[PDB]
Amino acid sequence: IAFDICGVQPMNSPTGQVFALRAVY
Amino acid sequence: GISYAAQGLATGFSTDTTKSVFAGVLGGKYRVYIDQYAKQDYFTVGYKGPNEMDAGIYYAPYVALTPLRGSDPKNFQPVMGFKTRYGIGINPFAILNSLGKNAYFRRVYVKGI
Amino acid sequence: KSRQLKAAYSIELAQDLRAVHGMDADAELSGILATEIMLEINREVVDWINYSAQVGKSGMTLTPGSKAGVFDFQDPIDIRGARWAGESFKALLFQIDKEAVEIARQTGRGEGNFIIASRNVVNVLASVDTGISYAAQGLATGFSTDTTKSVFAGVLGGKYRVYIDQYAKQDYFTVGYKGPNEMDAGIYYAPYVALTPLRGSDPKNFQPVMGFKTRYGIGINPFAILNSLGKNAYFRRVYVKGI
Amino acid sequence: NLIAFDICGVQPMNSPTGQVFALRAVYKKFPALAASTQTTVGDIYTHFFQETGTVYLQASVQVTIDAGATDAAKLDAEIKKQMEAGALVEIAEGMATSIAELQEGFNGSTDNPWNEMGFRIDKQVIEAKSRQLKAAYSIELAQDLRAVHGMDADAELSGILATEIMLEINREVVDWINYSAQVGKSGMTLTPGSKAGVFDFQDPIDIRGARWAGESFKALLFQIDKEAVEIARQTGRGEGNFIIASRNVVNVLASVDTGISYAAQGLATGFSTDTTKSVFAGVLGGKYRVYIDQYAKQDYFTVGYKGPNEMDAGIYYAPYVALTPLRGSDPKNFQPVMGFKTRYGIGINPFAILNSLGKNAYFRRVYVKGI
């Protein structure tokens, strides 16, 4: 439930990685 | 309806307190949850897009509620427990590069309550 | 007499070995454990040989100008005036022939049939008799396709089957005799139980435990372990120096 | 081209970061040999000589060692005499082994030492590190290679680059091995007159009494074996299985042991039909698969171990992407774009990059002089 306000992209292995749609700044 | 009182709970003399959920929606705008372990008094406002990649924070569960079992012959007592594995992430914003740096969230200490 | 080993391993690692590369995880650990307990038994057999073997390059096997028990590759007496390693290495095999004879004499059963030796010595002995000591070029060809380093290299001079002691302590070789009769070894290993599996967990966190236990017992020619330390006529132990 | 990483665990990735596994290892008190001592055959006694420390001698003979030798000088003379006479025979670590075996056997008990395989078994996270090159060729060159020779122009450039990027990757693999390899000709692999980590072909001590290059070459091989032995000891997995070395060293090996490294004289005879110098030259002693480092900086050899298990290597390489082509042209002058990019990632048994430099149990690096 911890992630109801987070991205999850659950992994099928540790390490494992996620993507983030970061602005260029 | 920012925080659901659950009068039925009170009415029935604490039938099921369900203290594991979002309280409700503040102003019809913010889904709000109680930090049950807050150290003092504060609030944090955050953004979450429909695309999980637009959360600015990630939780990526791999393992959950793996039971532990057995017994410890030294006192011959039962072994029971639980393990999970998940991992977190924060949008880079450049943990060293995340402390007090996250554009998706703002936190304020609150006094006078 | 028994020996026992455990896996004592992490849950998460077992999970990842399977999840990441399709590895059989704990099954592989089991293979390691079976290997390790067998290697330890094997190491023990060698330790007993090197416990009980009589001191070699002694008595009937001494050169008058020798150093009593040590074959020094830099010593002109031991190497019989040899020129370079080529001749010197051969001089060692000659001392081995001398040890083999003393064994023959005392045992009354015939000269030494096999050798147990250190990596240094084996590499030396493998430098003579061309292809006799299995270098395992086929394994090298396949890039250590299956190392199998639990075997005898081969037969030196066509006479001594030579094995490498993976656990060699310093630098030595021991020449020993073995007849076709199981009663003609002078040393015995008589397995009763082998590779009995272990199954359990560490209660602090329920992490798994696997492993193996064996029972085999050992023996000697009576020789009269009170009567074996430095007394076993079937073997002669020589210290090696200078490699 | 060929794969340097044929001697690495591979465990290929399907995602960078991304991980590999490795089989990481866990990591004389004899009463006295002195005046009046009556030794008894087979047992072991300790004597400290006035000169050159101690010896441990095992009796071959039951004998009283000069009960009147209360003067250590007399005693040394008598003990030496008994050794010279063959009554007492010297062994050092083997005695330590023997006393332990005696004590362990005699007092053996089940108690609670269930032992364990001496292995932690571990893992590393590795990124699919990239390497990339541009063909960077001109139109005019292409026009004339086609017009003059009937050549396929950029096709040749493409083949060269693909070869070069793979070669550079192989060069990197070798440098990582040399980086992590422990110093050789050190500790267990030293000789009394040694120069600490270097083999000098002109030095009688290093070359073990060898006559000229012919035998010094073989003496190098002896030092190689010493390194291989040390690797087996420290790894707990096995003898070095392969050699990576400089051109000088490879020529040293090719010049000895009849047929270990090959000239591949068919290629030479045919006028360099394909030099293929990305393949192990052959096998030293029938034991060590040997390869040439095209980029060796000075002169050196490295001995390393590789098991049959992909987890047993010290060095791991897990390819993700290979030879992704480039294409196009820059309109400012329209010169063409072509080339290649790869992604692979490496891992090194942790031995605790920072913890692999000069620390890797699987490899030993020795500097070479005198060739």
Phi then psi for D189, rounded to 5 degrees? -105, 15
Phi then psi for C233, rounded to 5 degrees? -60, -20
The radius of gyration computed from the CA coordinates of chain A, to the nearest angstrom, equals 11
- Write down the H helix ranges in D68-138: 72-84, 93-106
**Alpha carbon D190 to chain centroid distance?**
15
Q: For residue D304, which of D293, D316, D317, D314 has the smallest C-alpha distance?
A: D314
Cβ(C73)–Cβ(C242) under 8 Å? Answer: yes
Encoded tokens for C84: 């370079």
Q: Return d(Cα B53, Cα D356) in angstroms, integer.
A: 35
Q: For residue D297, which of D349, D368, D228 has the smallest C-alpha distance?
A: D368
* Long-range CB pairs of D320-329, under 8 A, 24+ apart, other chains included: D320/D12, D320/D13, D320/D14, D320/D15, D320/D16, D320/D18, D320/D128, D320/D344, D320/D345, D321/D128, D321/D130, D323/D162, D323/D165, D325/D158, D326/D134, D326/D135
Note whether D touches A: 3 CB pairs or more under 8 A.
yes
Tell me the one-letter amino acid at C155: V
Nearest residue on chain C to B73, alpha-carbon basis: C203
Cβ(D35)–Cβ(D70) under 8 Å? Answer: yes
Sequence-distant (6+) residues with CB within 8 A of D174 are D4, D244, D293, D295
Cβ(D351)–Cβ(D363) under 8 Å? Answer: no
Biggest distance spanned by C-alpha atoms of chain D? 104
**A5 to chain D nearest CA, in Å?**
26
Contacts of B63 in chain C (CB under 8 A): 12, 15
Q: Return d(Cα C222, Cα C208) in angstroms, integer.
A: 44
* Residue C116, Cβ density class (10 Å: 0-12 exposed, 13-18 middle, ≥19 buried): buried
Note whether B touches A: 3 CB pairs or more under 8 A.
yes
Q: For residue C144, which of D182, D313, D60, A10 has the smallest C-alpha distance?
A: D313
Q: How was this structure determined?
A: cryo-EM
Q: What is the resolution of this structure in A?
A: 5.1
Strand partners, D44: D58
Residue D126 DSSP one-character state: -
Q: Return d(Cα C89, Cα C156) in angstroms, integer.
A: 12
Residue D148 DSSP one-character state: I
| Residue of B65, B79, B80 best to disrupt the C interface, most CBs of C under 10 A | B79
| Residue of D125, D126, D320 best to disrupt the A interface, most CBs of A under 10 A | D125
Contacts of A12 in chain C (CB under 8 A): 19
Q: Return d(Cα B16, Cα B9) in angstroms, integer.
A: 6
CA distances from C163 to B112, C137, C167, D305 (A): 83, 17, 12, 20
Cβ(C167)–Cβ(C46) under 8 Å? Answer: yes
Q: For residue D234, which of D87, D70, D76, D362 has the smallest C-alpha distance?
A: D362
* Residue D100, Cβ density class (10 Å: 0-12 exposed, 13-18 middle, ≥19 buried): middle
CA distances from C148 to A1, C120, C139, C141 (A): 52, 19, 9, 14
Give C 88-117 residues with CB within 8 A of chain D. Answer: none
Bond preceding residue A16 cis, omega within 30 of 0? yes
Q: Return d(Cα C52, Cα C240) in angstroms, integer.
A: 18
- The residue count for chain A: 25
Tell me the one-letter amino acid at B41: D
Tell me the one-letter amino acid at B1: G
Contact C204 B72 (CB under 8 A): yes
Q: Return d(Cα D238, Cα D261) in angstroms, integer.
A: 22
3-state class (DSSP) for residue C4: strand
Cβ(C218)–Cβ(C39) under 8 Å? Answer: no
Residue D115 DSSP one-character state: E
Contacts of B64 in chain C (CB under 8 A): none
Cβ–Cβ contacts within 10 Å for residue B83, how many?
A: 14
Give A 1-25 residues with CB within 8 A of chain C. Answer: 12-14
Q: Return d(Cα C114, Cα C122) in angstroms, integer.
A: 12
- Please report how many Cα atoms fall inside a 13 Å half-sphere around the Cα of residue C12, on the Cβ side: 13
Phi then psi for D125, rounded to 5 degrees? -100, 125
Strands D54-59 and D88-90: antiparallel
Contacts of A16 in chain B (CB under 8 A): 60, 62, 87
- Write down the H helix ranges in chain C: 11-21, 26-52, 84-107, 119-125, 137-141
Q: Return d(Cα C100, Cα C229) in angstroms, integer.
A: 19
Q: Return d(Cα D19, Cα D11) in angstroms, integer.
A: 8
Residue B53 DSSP one-character state: G
Phi then psi for D328, rounded to 5 degrees? 125, -155
